[PDB]
Amino acid sequence: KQKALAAALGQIEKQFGKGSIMRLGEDRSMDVETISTGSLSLDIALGAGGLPMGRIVEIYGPESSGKTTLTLQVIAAAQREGKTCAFIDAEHALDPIYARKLGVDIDNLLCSQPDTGEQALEICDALARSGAVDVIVVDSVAALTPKAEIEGEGLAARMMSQAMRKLAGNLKQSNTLLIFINQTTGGNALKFYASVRLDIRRIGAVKEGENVVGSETRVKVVKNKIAAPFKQAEFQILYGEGINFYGELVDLGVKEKLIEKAGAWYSYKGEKIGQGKANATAWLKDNPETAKEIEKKVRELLLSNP
């Protein structure tokens, strides 16, 4: 019965490798170093608690979907840990003012604005082989124009395929995380080589009465080779501020029974934290020590770990 199945799946993983197959509800994950996305719900949706070092990740969605914010939050989180980041740009749209607001150390951010799509990929491969960079962000796949097209002479897909295998191997060896931002364009190479694929969309507005101050966002983990796929995350992205992390903390804290909200006050460990979600959120922001403890517990309860 159970043994027969467990033994069968074992054979599958033995022949095809770890992560080749799993029950969507299992609390299993690869032992990979991760970098936070800046979103607690997304970190949980990823199972491993963040994006995996040494792998290829694809983040796609419509313009203004939030992929820009997400990408910058990842860079900021990485730099926070002392990790070196490189931005390979073919979009020419980085906003350093917004980036700094999200905590990005722009002064120390490495940047290249390649002459062709092929050159952009070659630079990524060189950086991957160097083992001197921790995170590489490519903005974006759709903008990586093949040299032949630029000169006005399927091509994009061919360009991606010819570089992906070597890139993936070099990234794994140096434990470098590479994120491809997309809108997906580029062919099947990225789709199959990616260890994680994120579908991000704006599903509504955040208002302060009549004034729109943010966006309701939803990210679906459509592909995940480090933990079970298909979980999703919903959170708010506030203009000029980024992901409303504390709002997520309150919601998850309440859902997991860590934060109580019956009666006139929300409370944690029996202590008052605020009247209403807003005040409770602001309180956690003003009390990092407690916020940190709640986050730790939420991760312990919801991450896909043994």
- Binding-site residue positions: 61-68
Q: How far is the CB of 216 from Ca ion (least distance, A)?
A: 7
Buried b (16+ CB within 10 A) or exposed e, 101-112: ebebeeeebeeb
Q: Which does residue 15 bind out of a second copy, Ca ion, none, counting CB within 5 to 8 angstroms by kind?
A: a second copy
For a second copy, which is the closer residue by CB, 93 or 301?
93
Q: Which does residue 8 bind out of a second copy, Ca ion, none, counting CB within 5 to 8 angstroms by kind?
A: a second copy
Stretch that binds a second copy, among 124-132, 200-208, 278-286, 297-305 (CB under 8 A): 124-132
Confirm or reject binding of residue 255 to a second copy (CB under 8 A).
no
Binding site for Ca ion (CB under 5 A): 131, 262-263, 265, 267
Residue among 81, 188, 239, 272 that touches a second copy (CB under 8 A)? 188
Cβ contact 280:259 at 8 Å: yes
Binders in 72-101 for a second copy, by CB under 8 A:
84, 86, 92-97
Q: Which does residue 211 bind out of a second copy, Ca ion, none, counting CB within 5 to 8 angstroms by kind?
A: none
Confirm or reject binding of residue 267 to a second copy (CB under 8 A).
no
d(CA 60, CA 161): 18
Q: How far is the CB of 151 from a second copy (least distance, A)?
A: 6
Confirm or reject binding of residue 119 to a second copy (CB under 8 A).
yes
Q: Which two tokens stand for residue 224?
A: 């995940």
Confirm or reject binding of residue 205 to a second copy (CB under 8 A).
no
Confirm or reject binding of residue 256 to a second copy (CB under 8 A).
no
The count of residues interacting with a second copy (CB under 8 A) is 71
Q: How many other CB atoms are there within 10 angstroms of residue 139's CB atom?
A: 23
Cβ contact 226:29 at 8 Å: yes
For a second copy, which is the closer residue by CB, 73 or 224?
224
Q: Where are the alpha helices (DSSP H) in 102-256?
A: 117-130, 147-150, 155-174, 189-193, 245-255
For a second copy, which is the closer residue by CB, 196 or 280?
196
Stretch that binds a second copy, among 42-50, 151-159, 204-212, 277-285 (CB under 8 A): 151-159
Q: State the binding site for ATP.
A: 61-68
Confirm or reject binding of residue 20 to a second copy (CB under 8 A).
yes
d(CA 251, CA 149): 48
Q: How far is the CB of 260 from Ca ion (least distance, A)?
A: 5
Q: How far is the CB of 135 from a second copy (least distance, A)?
A: 13
Cβ contact 86:135 at 8 Å: yes
Taking each helix axis from N to C end, the angle separating 155-174 and 117-130, rounded to the nearest 10 degrees, works out to 10
Confirm or reject binding of residue 121 to a second copy (CB under 8 A).
no
Cβ contact 47:195 at 8 Å: no
Q: How far is the CB of 249 from a second copy (least distance, A)?
A: 23
Question: Three-class SS of residue 215?
Answer: strand
Identify the CA nearest to 164 among candidates 145, 132, 188, 140. 188
Confirm or reject binding of residue 111 to a second copy (CB under 8 A).
yes
CA torsion angle for 128, 132, 134, 135 (degrees, to 10)? -60
DSSP state of 29: B
Confirm or reject binding of residue 162 to a second copy (CB under 8 A).
yes
Neighbouring residues of 211: CB distance < 8 A, sequence distance ≥ 6: none
d(CA 268, CA 282): 14
Binders in 30-59 for a second copy, by CB under 8 A:
none
